[PDB]
Design an enzyme around this catalytic site. Structure first.
Site, PDB file in Angstrom:
ATOM      1  N   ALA B  49       0.848  -1.191   0.000  1.00  6.23           N
ATOM      2  CA  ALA B  49       0.000   0.000   0.000  1.00  6.23           C
ATOM      3  C   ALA B  49       0.881   1.238   0.000  1.00  6.23           C
ATOM      4  O   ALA B  49       1.938   1.253   0.644  1.00  6.23           O
ATOM      5  CB  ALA B  49      -0.908  -0.008   1.204  1.00  6.23           C
ATOM      6  N   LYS B  78      -6.031   3.290  -3.775  1.00  2.00           N
ATOM      7  CA  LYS B  78      -6.119   3.391  -2.347  1.00  2.00           C
ATOM      8  C   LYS B  78      -6.464   4.846  -2.001  1.00  2.00           C
ATOM      9  O   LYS B  78      -5.701   5.747  -2.343  1.00  2.00           O
ATOM     10  CB  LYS B  78      -4.797   2.983  -1.736  1.00  2.00           C
ATOM     11  CG  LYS B  78      -4.757   3.210  -0.254  1.00  2.00           C
ATOM     12  CD  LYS B  78      -3.364   3.031   0.279  1.00  2.00           C
ATOM     13  CE  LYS B  78      -3.322   3.595   1.696  1.00  2.00           C
ATOM     14  NZ  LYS B  78      -1.914   3.710   2.119  1.00  2.00           N
ATOM     15  N   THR B 347       4.425   3.466   4.911  1.00  2.00           N
ATOM     16  CA  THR B 347       5.562   4.391   4.792  1.00  2.00           C
ATOM     17  C   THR B 347       6.835   3.710   4.224  1.00  2.00           C
ATOM     18  O   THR B 347       7.848   4.365   4.027  1.00  2.00           O
ATOM     19  CB  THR B 347       5.921   4.973   6.178  1.00  2.00           C
ATOM     20  OG1 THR B 347       5.903   3.899   7.128  1.00  2.00           O
ATOM     21  CG2 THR B 347       4.915   6.015   6.595  1.00  2.00           C
ATOM     22  N   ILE B 349       7.758   2.133   1.247  1.00  2.00           N
ATOM     23  CA  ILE B 349       8.239   2.508  -0.063  1.00  2.00           C
ATOM     24  C   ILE B 349       8.457   4.012  -0.094  1.00  2.00           C
ATOM     25  O   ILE B 349       9.424   4.471  -0.662  1.00  2.00           O
ATOM     26  CB  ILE B 349       7.298   2.038  -1.169  1.00  2.00           C
ATOM     27  CG1 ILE B 349       7.386   0.502  -1.277  1.00  2.00           C
ATOM     28  CG2 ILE B 349       7.567   2.823  -2.487  1.00  2.00           C
ATOM     29  CD1 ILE B 349       6.171  -0.138  -2.000  1.00  2.00           C
TER      30      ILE B 349
HETATM   31  C1  LIG Z   1       5.596  -7.351   6.295  1.00  2.00           C
HETATM   32  C2  LIG Z   1       5.937  -6.148   5.475  1.00  2.00           C
HETATM   33  C3  LIG Z   1       4.883  -5.369   5.007  1.00  2.00           C
HETATM   34  C4  LIG Z   1       5.148  -4.250   4.217  1.00  2.00           C
HETATM   35  N1  LIG Z   1       4.117  -3.464   3.742  1.00  2.00           N
HETATM   36  C5  LIG Z   1       4.354  -2.326   2.984  1.00  2.00           C
HETATM   37  C6  LIG Z   1       3.294  -1.516   2.509  1.00  2.00           C
HETATM   38  O1  LIG Z   1       2.099  -1.752   2.718  1.00  2.00           O
HETATM   39  N2  LIG Z   1       3.597  -0.397   1.771  1.00  2.00           N
HETATM   40  C7  LIG Z   1       4.916  -0.061   1.515  1.00  2.00           C
HETATM   41  O2  LIG Z   1       5.170   0.960   0.878  1.00  2.00           O
HETATM   42  N3  LIG Z   1       5.955  -0.859   1.978  1.00  2.00           N
HETATM   43  C8  LIG Z   1       5.688  -1.981   2.714  1.00  2.00           C
HETATM   44  N4  LIG Z   1       6.734  -2.765   3.172  1.00  2.00           N
HETATM   45  C9  LIG Z   1       8.159  -2.421   2.857  1.00  2.00           C
HETATM   46  C10 LIG Z   1       8.481  -2.931   1.439  1.00  2.00           C
HETATM   47  O3  LIG Z   1       7.920  -4.198   1.112  1.00  2.00           O
HETATM   48  C11 LIG Z   1       9.995  -3.043   1.232  1.00  2.00           C
HETATM   49  O4  LIG Z   1      10.642  -1.965   1.850  1.00  2.00           O
HETATM   50  C12 LIG Z   1      10.252  -2.855  -0.230  1.00  2.00           C
HETATM   51  O5  LIG Z   1       9.324  -3.616  -0.998  1.00  2.00           O
HETATM   52  C13 LIG Z   1      11.732  -3.089  -0.610  1.00  2.00           C
HETATM   53  O6  LIG Z   1      12.565  -3.807   0.286  1.00  2.00           O
HETATM   54  P1  LIG Z   1      14.179  -3.821  -0.007  1.00  2.00           P
HETATM   55  O7  LIG Z   1      14.399  -3.671  -1.465  1.00  2.00           O
HETATM   56  O8  LIG Z   1      14.869  -2.799   0.866  1.00  2.00           O
HETATM   57  O9  LIG Z   1      14.748  -5.259   0.451  1.00  2.00           O
HETATM   58  P2  LIG Z   1      14.354  -6.693  -0.185  1.00  2.00           P
HETATM   59  O10 LIG Z   1      13.026  -6.727  -0.829  1.00  2.00           O
HETATM   60  O11 LIG Z   1      14.583  -7.655   1.031  1.00  2.00           O
HETATM   61  O12 LIG Z   1      15.347  -6.898  -1.406  1.00  2.00           O
HETATM   62  C14 LIG Z   1      16.664  -7.306  -1.103  1.00  2.00           C
HETATM   63  C15 LIG Z   1      17.434  -7.436  -2.408  1.00  2.00           C
HETATM   64  O13 LIG Z   1      18.822  -7.494  -2.077  1.00  2.00           O
HETATM   65  C16 LIG Z   1      19.393  -8.655  -2.653  1.00  2.00           C
HETATM   66  N5  LIG Z   1      20.530  -9.139  -1.853  1.00  2.00           N
HETATM   67  C17 LIG Z   1      20.572  -9.346  -0.498  1.00  2.00           C
HETATM   68  N6  LIG Z   1      21.813  -9.785  -0.185  1.00  2.00           N
HETATM   69  C18 LIG Z   1      22.533  -9.857  -1.325  1.00  2.00           C
HETATM   70  C19 LIG Z   1      23.855 -10.238  -1.564  1.00  2.00           C
HETATM   71  N7  LIG Z   1      24.551 -10.835  -0.584  1.00  2.00           N
HETATM   72  N8  LIG Z   1      24.329 -10.191  -2.857  1.00  2.00           N
HETATM   73  C20 LIG Z   1      23.513  -9.785  -3.909  1.00  2.00           C
HETATM   74  N9  LIG Z   1      22.204  -9.403  -3.653  1.00  2.00           N
HETATM   75  C21 LIG Z   1      21.738  -9.450  -2.382  1.00  2.00           C
HETATM   76  C22 LIG Z   1      18.243  -9.657  -2.746  1.00  2.00           C
HETATM   77  O14 LIG Z   1      18.503 -10.656  -3.727  1.00  2.00           O
HETATM   78  C23 LIG Z   1      17.107  -8.727  -3.149  1.00  2.00           C
HETATM   79  O15 LIG Z   1      17.240  -8.498  -4.535  1.00  2.00           O
HETATM   80  C24 LIG Z   1       6.474  -3.898   3.927  1.00  2.00           C
HETATM   81  C25 LIG Z   1       7.512  -4.676   4.410  1.00  2.00           C
HETATM   82  C26 LIG Z   1       7.270  -5.812   5.191  1.00  2.00           C
HETATM   83  C27 LIG Z   1       8.461  -6.633   5.663  1.00  2.00           C
HETATM   84  N1  LIG Z   2       1.786  13.166   3.948  1.00  2.00           N
HETATM   85  C1  LIG Z   2       1.257  11.777   3.834  1.00  2.00           C
HETATM   86  C2  LIG Z   2       0.661  11.250   5.149  1.00  2.00           C
HETATM   87  C3  LIG Z   2       0.300   9.731   5.083  1.00  2.00           C
HETATM   88  C4  LIG Z   2       1.147   8.671   5.106  1.00  2.00           C
HETATM   89  N2  LIG Z   2       0.447   7.504   5.035  1.00  2.00           N
HETATM   90  C5  LIG Z   2      -0.861   7.801   4.977  1.00  2.00           C
HETATM   91  C6  LIG Z   2      -2.014   6.999   4.891  1.00  2.00           C
HETATM   92 CL1  LIG Z   2      -1.831   5.278   4.828  1.00  2.00          CL
HETATM   93  C7  LIG Z   2      -3.291   7.584   4.828  1.00  2.00           C
HETATM   94  C8  LIG Z   2      -3.405   8.982   4.859  1.00  2.00           C
HETATM   95  C9  LIG Z   2      -2.264   9.797   4.929  1.00  2.00           C
HETATM   96  C10 LIG Z   2      -0.992   9.208   4.986  1.00  2.00           C
HETATM   97  C11 LIG Z   2       0.208  11.704   2.708  1.00  2.00           C
HETATM   98  O1  LIG Z   2      -0.807  12.431   2.734  1.00  2.00           O
HETATM   99  O2  LIG Z   2       0.410  10.924   1.770  1.00  2.00           O
HETATM  100 CL   LIG Z   3       4.846   0.324   5.205  1.00  2.00          CL
END
Ligand SMILES: Cc1cc2nc3c(=O)[nH]c(=O)nc-3n(C[C@H](O)[C@H](O)[C@H](O)COP(=O)(O)OP(=O)(O)OC[C@H]3O[C@@H](n4cnc5c(N)ncnc54)[C@H](O)[C@@H]3O)c2cc1C
Ligand SMILES: N[C@@H](Cc1c[nH]c2c(Cl)cccc12)C(=O)O
Ligand SMILES: [Cl-]
Ligand SMILES: Cc1cc2nc3c(=O)[nH]c(=O)nc-3n(C[C@H](O)[C@H](O)[C@H](O)COP(=O)(O)OP(=O)(O)OC[C@H]3O[C@@H](n4cnc5c(N)ncnc54)[C@H](O)[C@@H]3O)c2cc1C
Ligand SMILES: N[C@@H](Cc1c[nH]c2c(Cl)cccc12)C(=O)O
Ligand SMILES: [Cl-]
Lengths: 517, 517
Positions: B49, B78, B347, B349
């Site tokens: 999200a 959303k 938050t 992404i």
């Molecule tokens: C439960 C959960 C719910 C979430 N919900 C949301 C949400 O609703 N909205 C939102 O905006 N964000 C959400 N997030 C955050 C979001 O999913 C992640 O921050 C984002 O998608 C990217 O993560 P990342 O790229 O930092 O790490 P990862 O996705 O873990 O990617 C890691 C990368 O690094 C590589 N890598 C690792 N080690 C090595 C190595 N040794 N050598 C080469 N490559 C390596 C892997 O292969 C992979 O490509 C959520 C996260 C979690 C855990």
């Molecule tokens: N300044 C941000 C505040 C915010 C983060 N996450 C939110 C959600 Cl999930 C709903 C409403 C507002 C926000 C926004 O309005 O997008």
């Molecule tokens: Cl999040």
């Protein structure tokens, strides 16, 4: 086998206190009954409409006459449900109402008067079915009491009351007779390895044991659903409504009287109940969140009664259906923990005392013979599914086509084979179930009523009121002109009685005042 | 000083591919960018999200309109987060939901409408804050799209999508623009004696050098944590959850629609997200292993959606907090390698593209002036700690007291001075940060949004939705009856707009289908 000695009831709503009082009465000897109820979990009590079996099956069993309990719960009289705007595109310029009355239509040479009425209608007769076949609807239009001033009953009737006061009344009654009352909250339920409830752990540290557990925990089904994991059969494929917005509205009784009946006022995406008592009516817009938001429903509800944004609202949700089994192992669910059907025909509290009646009819020992609970379970299934179908029959037979909600009811519901069969017999011109008994006998013979709950008159009130008539009158009647003439004499009797009631009944408002202000 | 010429990004998740594409766009000339990603280490993508700045800060920067990327990632809309069962002991009979909406509440003579709403509530007004102060929540209840059928936007909105497809989309986009992609795994990181990263040794024998390294390695923080030994500030004294059990659940879109919002459903020991798209919703029970086992959490999660023991589950763990510094020497951590906060307000992404935006705002040469990274680091600290506090504010202001988890949230959290100060101002009846801008301007002015991320409306949606209201309305308002009257006219406008949206928006399901099936 050792008898049931200890019984624990979880829940202090209408269901819990009905269970406690019914069981203390039924189990004359060898029964220790404890009811646990949370001070922090509200009871459901919206202003409730009831049916005549409440007295005959429940309060008579306890030995409490109507005149005793009724003022203590600020009760008022209900002689029918009146359906408003269910027939067509509602039109503010047109009176669109019909009644569903309690009681039986008389038979004439083995054929109900409904059928002679239809033949007349085929020949141009204009009077609506229930006004022809029942003596009291005009009296309900005049807002008259179901009894003469001296208390002599003049029509079959039931009651409107706040279910909180009923629970209160029954709590008092049950505790004076030895029911142990614990104010506390069950937090954990321990099952043995066989899956039987061992004991309940409460927030205050009590451990409760029993031979038999009665789950009256409300919609959460603490024991039956949460602990025993009995599946709940969601029936939203049968009935669309899943929500209500409810309140109580002051009534100017002195200028407007008190309607001796429940009203069901069809809305765009559901219907609104009205349940009058002295000084106020309870009201709820029952709606389907699939066709209207709670926001729009609330606006529609406020607008209906000219209510303001300062008006308090009870925002209810519910799941329609019933447990796969009401009684599992040593736990019997009773009330909202067992099932829910929307209050379109006042069956909620009925389900409580009918189930309690059945429980005592299938009462276990500590061995819990599954043949007993299997039999009990099959009775509950039939009781509920039968009412579900009758309620559903108000929806799929509608001629309203003016909103998506009403179109979905005309086209998108799942229908049991049982309801289709009845509708088929009705449309063929056949009577549904008829009794030869008078009302007194019907309402005194609960094994009969329980199995024959909706009679020919009940279906006709609903189907004819909604504008769905049979394809033709009974072919038999074309061979029976003398029977047709006798039916005329019966129609004339009914009209005489209507006219006598008009001038003999006190207003419902005056009679209620006279009993207790 | 020589400019940064070679940049190596480690990681091919959302973070890595956002970094690659943002940097290739930002660094118009003199930049050779290489991304290394392991084929054996999964990416994190649970169904994600997002918030409106994703378009305005990220995709607009790249020059990719919403209509281009959105179908390629099977995106859905959303318009809010809807919080369910956060207010009280959840009760199956009670509708307990509130929205946190995107966008600003209007001001009336320098005072937000939230404050005029509270004064009304003091006088008995019953409508919930967000329904009074925002035009769209009723439309979200009706599951309506944020846009008219012709694409004309009608409310502020963001997106739901699988982050795997986003990474895929951006991988394609970035590689076509000259990003070198290496599929391989870093096994060793060599630092020089000064502690700067010299080179990476991969499993397949490659040695990678760069002027600048971007750690997008996910929670393992391969470069920032493991090689540079930057301390991670564990914040489990602030926020209790450390785990999730997640899955994807089929949705019957045709009967049930697609909710145009994320739901947060409070559980016994955490909360469950719901993130609808076409055909399915992603869902995760976010929980604290201190109050529930993963075993019980899994049972609670399956039970919530009526899911079976045959249902596949993603058993996630996480550490809440952030690196002491995001950027150390020649390594900038971006994404899960930098910090984590539970997805309660979408938050994650955001932290990636906001950090990338800041990195370009503080972009180094090969001399690595520490004044640049110190400034960058302080921006990240403020961004994260600010969001951490806002998320924490959902927990310590709860009135739920029905489990140890909720009691610990009421009593046992460590609170920053910053959050206490805000809560104090709120309770005094003071507005938090208000803007005079409309949404378009707010969401177009990222230096403003970044520093003023949570406005008065955001705090009110959360605090008022949770049942924590100020002690009293603004004393100023007792001197301003004309302003109160003007506020009424604004409340009436909002209601008009709600009613127009009700009848003008296509369902979210229909609109999504229309764009791309
Ligand atoms: C439960 C959960 C719910 C979430 N919900 C949301 C949400 O609703 N909205 C939102 O905006 N964000 C959400 N997030 C955050 C979001 O999913 C992640 O921050 C984002 O998608 C990217 O993560 P990342 O790229 O930092 O790490 P990862 O996705 O873990 O990617 C890691 C990368 O690094 C590589 N890598 C690792 N080690 C090595 C190595 N040794 N050598 C080469 N490559 C390596 C892997 O292969 C992979 O490509 C959520 C996260 C979690 C855990
Ligand atoms: N300044 C941000 C505040 C915010 C983060 N996450 C939110 C959600 Cl999930 C709903 C409403 C507002 C926000 C926004 O309005 O997008
Ligand atoms: Cl999040
Ligand atoms: C909108 C609506 C309209 C209705 N209209 C009618 C009508 O017109 N006519 C009619 O006959 N019926 C009607 N009904 C049905 C009727 O109101 C209820 O069935 C009836 O009043 C009793 O409900 P109950 O006792 O099963 O559950 P509740 O009233 O929900 O009582 C639950 C009890 O269980 C207790 N409890 C729950 N959990 C725990 C726990 N953990 N530990 C200890 N105690 C616990 C609570 O404290 C409470 O005492 C209506 C119902 C609804 C929802
Ligand atoms: N056998 C039941 C049928 C019934 C249930 N609800 C009703 C109502 Cl609300 C009106 C008339 C009849 C009924 C009765 O006559 O009480
Ligand atoms: Cl009912």
């Amino acid at each position: 086998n050792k008898p049931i000695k200890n019984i624990v009831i979880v829940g202090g709503g209408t269901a819990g206190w009905m269970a406690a009082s019914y069981l203390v009465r039924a189990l004359q000897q060898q029964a220790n009954i404890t009811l646990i109820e949370s001070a922090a979990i509200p009871r459901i009590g919206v202003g409730e409409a009831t049916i005549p079996s409440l007295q005959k099956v429940f309060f008579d069993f306890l030995g409490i006459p109507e005149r005793e309990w009724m003022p203590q719960v600020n009760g008022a009289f209900k002689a029918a449900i009146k359906f408003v705007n269910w027939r067509k595109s509602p039109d503010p310029s047109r009176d669109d109402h019909f009644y569903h009355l309690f009681g039986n239509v008389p038979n004439c040479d083995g054929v109900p008067l409904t059928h002679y009425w239809l033949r007349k209608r085929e020949q141009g007769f204009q009077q609506p079915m229930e006004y022809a076949c029942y003596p009291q609807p005009g009296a309900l239009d005049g807002k008259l009491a179901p009894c003469l001033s001296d208390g002599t009953r003049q029509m079959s009737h039931a009651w409107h009351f706040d279910a909180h006061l009923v629970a209160d009344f029954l709590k008092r009654w049950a505790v004076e007779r030895g029911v142990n009352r614990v104010v506390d909250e069950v937090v954990d339920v321990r099952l043995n390895n066989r899956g039987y409830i061992s004991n309940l752990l409460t927030k205050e540290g009590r451990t409760l044991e029993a031979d038999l557990f009665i789950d009256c925990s409300g919609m959460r089904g603490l024991l039956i659903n949460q602990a025993l994991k009995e599946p709940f059969i969601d029936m939203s494929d049968y009935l669309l409504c899943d929500s209500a917005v409810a309140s109580a509205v002051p009534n100017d009784d002195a200028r407007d009287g008190v309607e001796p009946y429940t009203s069901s006022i069809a809305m765009n995406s559901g219907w609104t109940w009205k349940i009058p008592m002295l000084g106020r009516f309870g009201s709820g817009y029952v709606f389907s969140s699939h066709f209207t938001s709670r926001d729009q429903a609330t606006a529609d509800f406020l607008k209906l009664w000219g209510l303001s944004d300062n008006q308090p609202l009870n925002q209810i949700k519910f799941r329609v259906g019933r447990n796969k089994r009401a009684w599992v192992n040593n736990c019997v669910s009773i009330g909202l923990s067992s099932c829910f059907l929307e209050p379109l025909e006042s069956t909620g509290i009925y389900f409580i005392y009918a189930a309690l009646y059945q429980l005592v009819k299938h009462f276990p020992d500590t061995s819990f013979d599954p043949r007993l609970s299997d039999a009990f379970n099959a009775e509950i299934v039939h009781m509920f599914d039968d009412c579900r179908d009758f309620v559903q029959a108000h929806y799929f037979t509608t001629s309203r086509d003016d909103t998506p909600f009403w179109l979905a009811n005309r086209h998108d519901l799942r229908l049991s084979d049982a309801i289709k069969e009845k509708v088929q017999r009705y449309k063929a011109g056949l009577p549904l179930t008829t009794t030869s008994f008078d009302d007194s006998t019907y309402y005194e013979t609960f094994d009969y009523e329980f199995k024959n709950f909706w009679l020919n008159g009940n279906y006709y009130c609903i189907f004819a009121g909604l504008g769905m008539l049979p394809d033709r009158s009974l072919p038999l009647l074309q061979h029976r002109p003398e029977s047709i003439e006798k039916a005329e004499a019966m129609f004339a009797s009914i009209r005489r009685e209507a006219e006598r009631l008009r001038t003999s009944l006190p207003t419902n408002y005056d009679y209620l005042r006279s009993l207790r202000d």
